[PDB]
Structures are given as structure tokens and as C-alpha cells.
From a paper:
Insulin is a 51-amino-acid protein hormone with two disulfide-linked chains (A1–A21 and B1–B30) that is responsible for the maintenance of metabolic homeostasis, with an impact on cell proliferation and regulation of ageing. It exerts its functions through binding as a monomer to the tyrosine kinase-type IR, which is an (αβ)2 heterotetramer in which each individual αβ extracellular chain comprises L1, CR, L2, FnIII-1, FnIII-2 and FnIII-3 domains. Therefore, we undertook further mutagenesis-driven studies of insulin, focusing on the TyrB26 site that we assumed might be the critical structural pivot of insulin conformational activation on its receptor.
In the cases of [PheB26]-insulin and [GlyB26]-insulin, we aimed to investigate the structural consequences of the loss of the TyrB26 side-chain hydroxyl group or the whole TyrB26 side chain, respectively. Loss of chirality at the [name] site (GlyB26 mutant) and replacement of the phenolic Tyr side chain by a polar Gln and Asp (GlnB26 and AspB26 mutants) did not have a detrimental, or a major, effect on the affinities of these two types of analogues (∼70, ∼77 and 89%, respectively). The most important feature of these analogues is the occurrence of the B25–B30 bend that detaches this part of the B-chain from the insulin core. In consequence, insulin site 1-related A-chain side chains are fully revealed. It seems that the B24–B25 peptide bond in [AsnB26]- and [GlyB26]-insulins serves as a ‘rotation axis’ for the B25–B30 chain, sweeping it almost 180° away from its wild-type direction. The [AsnB26]- and [GlyB26]-insulin structures show high similarity up to [name] Cα (only ∼0.3 Å between these atoms), but the B27–B30 chains proceed in opposite directions in these analogues. This is likely to result from the lack of conformational restraints of [name] glycine, as the crystal packings in both analogues are virtually identical. The dimerization properties of [GlyB26]-insulin were not determined in this work, but it can supposed that they will be significantly lower than that of native insulin. Comparison of the [GlyB26]- and [AsnB26]-insulin structures with the previously reported high-affinity [name]-turn-containing truncated insulins suggests that the direction of the B-chain in the [name]-shortened analogues may vary without having a large detrimental effect on their IR affinity. In summary, the [AsnB26]- and [GlyB26]-insulin analogues are the first naturally substituted insulins with a stable conformation that differs from that in all known structures of the native hormone.
Numbering used by the authors:
A (entry chain B): 2 to 29
B (entry chain A): 1 to 21
The structure:
């Protein structure tokens, strides 16, 4: 099993845990 | 930062959660 979040696994993961709050700023 | 913490090393949920907003 591979524990590192790279690329779109790191992205797909932020989308999950951030929820409505999101990340990469908010517009606005 | 994140890529280092979560891709080069391994990051706990709460590490990962602090790059949100």
C-alpha cells in the first residue's frame, strides 16, 4: 500500500477533506 | 509545504486539513 498523496490524488484528497471551505482561495 | 509533506513524506489527516480555505 502506498501512503503518499501525489498529483490528482493530492487534489482529489483536498476536495474531499476541505468540503465547502475548499482550498486555493475563494472567489469574490 | 504540502507536496513535501503529503507526497514526499506522509501526512496525517490534520496536516493535510490545514492547507484548506
Amino acid at each position: 500500500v502506498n501512503q503518499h498523496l501525489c498529483g490528482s490524488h493530492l487534489v482529489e484528497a483536498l476536495y474531499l477533506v476541505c468540503g465547502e471551505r475548499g482550498f486555493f482561495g475563494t472567489p469574490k | 509545504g504540502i507536496v513535501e509533506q503529503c507526497c514526499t513524506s506522509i501526512c496525517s489527516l490534520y496536516q493535510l486539513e490545514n492547507y484548506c480555505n
